[PDB]
Design an enzyme around this catalytic site. Structure first.
Site, PDB file in Angstrom:
ATOM      1  N   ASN A 152       0.941  -1.183  -0.201  1.00  0.00           N
ATOM      2  CA  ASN A 152       0.077   0.662   0.255  1.00  0.00           C
ATOM      3  C   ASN A 152       0.979   1.564  -0.312  1.00  0.00           C
ATOM      4  O   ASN A 152       1.934   1.210  -0.234  1.00  0.00           O
ATOM      5  CB  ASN A 152      -0.581  -0.091   1.230  1.00  0.00           C
ATOM      6  CG  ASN A 152       0.343   0.283   2.394  1.00  0.00           C
ATOM      7  OD1 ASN A 152       1.063  -0.573   3.202  1.00  0.00           O
ATOM      8  ND2 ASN A 152      -0.407   1.393   3.196  1.00  0.00           N
TER       9      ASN A 152
ATOM     10  N   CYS B 228       1.601   3.054   2.408  1.00  0.00           N
ATOM     11  CA  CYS B 228       3.049   3.320   3.549  1.00  0.00           C
ATOM     12  C   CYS B 228       4.098   1.553   3.301  1.00  0.00           C
ATOM     13  O   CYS B 228       4.808   1.904   4.533  1.00  0.00           O
ATOM     14  CB  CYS B 228       2.682   3.783   4.579  1.00  0.00           C
ATOM     15  SG  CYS B 228       1.383   5.378   4.308  1.00  0.00           S
TER      16      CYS B 228
ATOM     17  N   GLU C 156       3.241  -1.207   4.637  1.00  0.00           N
ATOM     18  CA  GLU C 156       2.791  -2.016   5.487  1.00  0.00           C
ATOM     19  C   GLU C 156       2.122  -3.577   5.152  1.00  0.00           C
ATOM     20  O   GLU C 156       2.292  -3.952   5.961  1.00  0.00           O
ATOM     21  CB  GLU C 156       2.928  -1.409   6.508  1.00  0.00           C
ATOM     22  CG  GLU C 156       1.392  -1.019   7.070  1.00  0.00           C
ATOM     23  CD  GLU C 156       0.983   0.434   6.585  1.00  0.00           C
ATOM     24  OE1 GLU C 156      -0.123   0.802   7.197  1.00  0.00           O
ATOM     25  OE2 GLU C 156       1.753   0.775   6.079  1.00  0.00           O
TER      26      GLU C 156
END
Ligand SMILES: Nc1ncnc2c1ncn2[C@H]1C[C@H](O)[C@@H](COP(=O)(O)OP(=O)(O)OP(=O)(O)O)O1
Ligand SMILES: Nc1ncnc2c1ncn2[C@H]1C[C@H](O)[C@@H](COP(=O)(O)OP(=O)(O)OP(=O)(O)O)O1
Ligand SMILES: [Mg+2]
Ligand SMILES: [Mg+2]
Lengths: 644, 657
Positions: A351, A353, A355
């Protein structure tokens, strides 16, 4: 400080009774329209009014003073609802709105959450803080999508999705590797494709256009490309500050979804083949040995548009990282090998960011609901860690995120289908560095290193127990049977790690084997850039940012006060004792950082938004850093490269 | 030199038509190994069933009829290649195009083949490219209105644009319903940034999605009504200078102008800027009804900014002085004089400003285009052959009506639209050449009558064909309640009485009895490519220059014949296509070959209004002013407006651009 004064002023300028502030919010009439535009759902207001004495009186307004200066200002700007430009909500109202918003009719549950939140044991994500208890609420943070099809119709259908998701205040990771490359034939127009660069420019301007919700926070799309794609060199240029606008798309974010073979070929200075996914279908739909098999057969078959030296592409990756700190680095094969969703097919990206590792497909859009535990709260004045209290709160969070899956209004129905099938969630942390500080452990210390494992051991254990009981109450998730977890395989198993003696995994395995679990994924350390600032803790799993935030760090202060006495290694007065403890992120080995990430990694079924701080990044230092991370087993070798 | 070029192609190509078609169909991609027919099985099959008639119908000498460049353009783009090697001779192409339209009706196919090969008219490039093939998107123009003032509808309309451009369609898009900068968005509780950043998305879509293989960049024309709050920024979008986030330089730009605006500019009154969200439905009314809605919103205080009408006017002129845009369309004239006004308010025109067709949320209007070569109709007697013009217009009408029924529409809203109302667009080229052939200067009163009578003829012709089609097939779906169904033809709507050349009474008897098959018929389009192919001056434009280095075929001929014609070439070139200062050429020939830059634009506008009365759509009318200024452009726009014109200007052309 002056934080007290501002809080006192907020209390002056707001009603104190929680159900009254809620009435004002529901009753609100837009004065330019004359339209009744409630800022809270009637359903929530009703439950509140039927339980007002108990709910109003549960609220500890003195907790509002618990925030520091920048924390209180942040809430004031963005988290507290406004009636006509004037703040109506106190922080405590906002937290009790969120709490009833999640819990509805169950007041007992609502008060438990309220207190946990208000005391700051954990927090929910901004989209949940913003939208819980309001009308048709979108409470999720993360969305993931695969490009629908290699077609103008699919490109634009997927673009509509990004638009709608981003309006709904979500972040996006998009897999684009199936789009055919510069130069490739188009039967339909007897023409030649221009490939990804100009396609991405449309996405770029679509992100500049559609704000994340309505507080002027700009669209955020992370684009994922596997480095076997022919357009890779140009892709690694898209975020650079110079060049011609036609060759750029600087408002997007960039990630590489990297196979093992590529790193393999780079290490050995072997050749690297560039392909078009139209000439070479399905490379993004296999991983590991199966990827390696299909890739190599394609090269042996001449289905190759350009052969370059692997070190040449590597060099371009590193050039791009030095200029822009990007792209992010994910190891596709580590992502897929050690995912509890591998029964679903290959996972095509992470995604925004870096994670989330969740499955996507043309008719499934991965979604994740997020929450973070404040790891500083669990340290005693004894300098022990209260692991029982952590497991305990974790179980409440799991229960909370599970409920949100069911409440949420999804911006596209493929997101709803996805979440309802697999029920993934994402429990993260903040305050890790604060927890080390408070236990008097340098981040790099072996004590730090044991506590690091045992915290995530605890989170996962508690997280599993909670999901396991949810599975007894409600049945396991639709796609459970056939998953690794359904075969007694847990995350650490997949890393071939053996957990310390803190928890009794055996008993938990028996529980799961009998009842199964409600959620396909549970743990995922996100950035916490907003909520960390609100709670007054170091972001995430990052090392200590610095000794300053016009304010000095309260932990250094307290300790320097208790002894009677930016970096602090220059100040001769301060003992070497505390100099070790309060090292900044610039003064810590990044090798160590990667080891610890790997070490906590064994207890994390998704991944982790792992920044790397390097002062003066060079080819030498990034190369070793990346290979070390990959070889250590990381799902995400690097989110941002941070520098001065 | 052009002879050599043709016999080379004849050397390098199979003669027999049926065979070249086999090689097209039976074509295998050397890369793939995939059978990838370049013509359609059904069109091949028809050709083989009828190869004897068709093969021997072709007259390969006609290939020699193209001048140098016209032949090269054909070679570049219109003649299908088997691995980079042209396989098609121009006649093979024109016969393909003919069977591709008429199919089993070979009487019809040959009738059309001859007309085309002799260059009496031409079909539009789209039709020439894809007629007789697998993906036959034969139409040129598409028009769209933004579907809704919402992200859902902005992005749904964007996709439509995407799909349409891919299939080599040009686009006009109405964007006024989109709410303006600063305006409330209830569903996110925040505020819009208006049109600019939205058009940036469209802008990059047009860069991204080409028209065909040609590598033609997507061509979108954005239409706005000048009451919209974002108008000054809209007007800047195409300017060289400025930040990239305030620019959208690959788009094209038109204004859809109500009478009211033009009245307030002239009287120097205040003009109110509005947001459509605050002021709904301004683009869904025209005329008195618009006037009554605009005003009542001003009185209601639903107004985001007041400016002098003239401040906005100045910005429009500035914008045109640099880019030559936006196009100038008069909304009320467009709507007041449309046979589609039964359908509701028309919201925009197309890429090239000549079609005026209704659009809605369920309908994307389409036009199929063809041009009559007006040069051809001049006889050796120096008379104009109006009966031959009419006879050929009927054929064309019939072709474009068949095309409606076989066309591959890229979006279902086009299919719906075209099948419901059946608009066609017949246009012209060689207007300047026809005047020159008849020895009339462009501005002479003789040219002015010919102008009127040419277009009177095309219209009568088109109507009589469409009526015959209505006799045969039934009128079009939405015909009843149209002006034409009440006895009101285009010219009535301009209060013009036709000359005595044609019997309009008889034609109205026929129409009153059977009605009409097509809701619109006539629309002079730019003809940039096909005029080059056919060797004719573009469209309705005056003579553009005496040099193209090829001296105009008519001046050449006229001079040689009188014995006045080598060096001349160089002197005409050094006066920039003009002959007005060459000593040797009589005053006779100077008046006849005045160029566009030596011709009064007021007269040009007058003549467009006058043909205007016999054109049920509009006309791609460029304006040529060598050295523009504010007074000059102003009086030009006002004269065109007051003259009743639908399109007041397409491009502003000047010495610089
Ligand atoms: N007009 C165009 N301009 C730029 N790119 C295009 C254009 N048309 C298609 N593409 C790209 C988009 C995809 O990456 C690829 C295929 O697009 P698509 O819409 O599926 O064409 P197609 O279906 O007619 O031919 P095919 O069967 O080869 O896919 O080519
Ligand atoms: N997130 C956004 N960023 C920028 N502009 C937006 C955003 N959302 C909407 N807009 C623009 C697009 C439209 O022109 C206008 C309305 O958008 P729309 O999708 O209908 O919002 P909405 O339905 O939530 O609110 P409303 O009921 O006010 O229309 O505002
Ligand atoms: Mg396709
Ligand atoms: Mg709306």
């Amino acid at each position: 400080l002056a934080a007290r004064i501002a809080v006192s002023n907020l209390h002056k300028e707001t009603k104190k009774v929680f159900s009254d502030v809620m009435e004002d919010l529901y009753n609100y009439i837009n004065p330019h329209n004359g339209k009744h535009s409630p800022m809270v759902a009637k359903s929530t207001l009703d439950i509140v009014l039927a339980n007002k004495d108990r709910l109003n009186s549960a609220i500890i307004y003195d907790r509002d003073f618990s925030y520091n200066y920048f924390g209180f200002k942040t809430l004031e700007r963005s988290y507290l609802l406004k009636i006509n430009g004037k703040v109506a909500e106190r922080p405590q109202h906002m937290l009790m709105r969120v709490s009833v918003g999640i819990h509805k009719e169950d007041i007992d549950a609502a008060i438990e959450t309220y207190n946990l939140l208000s005391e700051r044991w954990f927090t929910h994500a901004s989209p949940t803080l913003f939208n819980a208890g309001t009308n048709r609420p979108q409470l999720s943070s993360c969305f993931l999508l695969s490009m629908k099809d290699d077609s103008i119709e699919g490109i634009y259908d997927t673009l509509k999705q990004c638009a709608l998701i981003s309006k709904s205040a979500g972040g996006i990771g998009v897999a684009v590797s199936c789009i055919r490359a510069t130069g490739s034939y188009i039967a339909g127009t007897n023409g030649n494709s221009n490939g990804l660069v100009p396609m991405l420019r449309v996405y770029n301007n679509t992100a500049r256009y559609v704000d994340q919700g309505g507080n002027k926070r700009p669209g955020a799309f992370a684009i994922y490309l596997e480095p076997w794609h022919l357009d890779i060199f140009e892709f690694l240029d898209l975020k650079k500050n110079t060049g011609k606008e036609e060759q750029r798309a600087r408002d997007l974010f960039f990630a590489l979804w990297i196979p093992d073979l590529f790193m393999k070929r780079v290490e050995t200075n072997q050749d690297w083949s560039l392909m078009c996914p139209n000439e070479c279908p399905g490379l993004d739909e296999v991983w590991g040995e199966e990827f390696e098999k299909l890739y190599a057969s394609y090269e042996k078959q001449g289905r190759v548009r350009k052969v370059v030296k692997a070190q040449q592409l590597w060099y371009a990756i590193i050039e791009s990282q030095t200029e822009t700190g990007t792209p992010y680095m994910l190891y596709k094969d580590s992502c897929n090998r050690k995912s509890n969703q591998q029964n679903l097919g290959t996972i095509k990206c992470s995604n925004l960011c870096t994670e989330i590792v969740e499955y996507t497909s043309k008719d499934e859009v991965a979604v994740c609901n997020l929450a973070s535990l404040a790891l500083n709260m669990y340290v005693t004045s004894e300098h022990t860690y209260d692991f029982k209290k952590l497991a305990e709160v974790t179980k409440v969070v799991v229960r909370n995120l599970n409920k949100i899956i069911d409440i949420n209004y999804y911006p596209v129905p493929e997101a709803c289908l996805s979440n309802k099938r697999h029920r993934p969630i994402g429990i993260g942390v903040q305050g890790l560095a604060d927890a080390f500080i408070l236990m008097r452990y340098p981040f790099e210390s072996a004590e730090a290193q044991l506590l690091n494992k045992q915290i995530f051991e605890t989170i996962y254990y508690g997280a599993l127990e909670a999901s396991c009981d949810l599975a007894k109450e409600q049945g396991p998730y639709e796609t459970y049977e056939g998953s690794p977890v359904s075969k007694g395989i847990l995350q650490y198993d997949m890393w071939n790690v053996t957990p310390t003696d803190l928890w009794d995994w055996k008993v938990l395995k028996e529980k799961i084997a009998k009842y199964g679990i409600r959620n396909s994924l549970l743990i995922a350390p996100m950035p916490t850039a907003s909520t960390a600032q609100i709670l007054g803790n170091n972001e995430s799993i990052e090392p200590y940012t610095s000794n300053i935030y016009q304010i000095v760090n309260p932990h250094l202060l307290k300790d320097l006060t208790e002894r009677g006495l930016g970096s602090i290694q220059s100040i001769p007065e301060i003992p070497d004792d505390l100099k070790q403890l309060y090292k900044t992120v610039w003064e810590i080995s990044q090798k160590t950082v990667l080891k610890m990430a790997a070490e906590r990694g064994a207890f994390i079924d998704q991944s982790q938004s792992l920044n790397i701080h390097i002062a003066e990044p060079n080819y030498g230092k990034l190369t070793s850093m990346h290979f070390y991370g990959w070889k250590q087993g990381l799902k995400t070798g690097m989110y941002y490269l941070r520098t001065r």
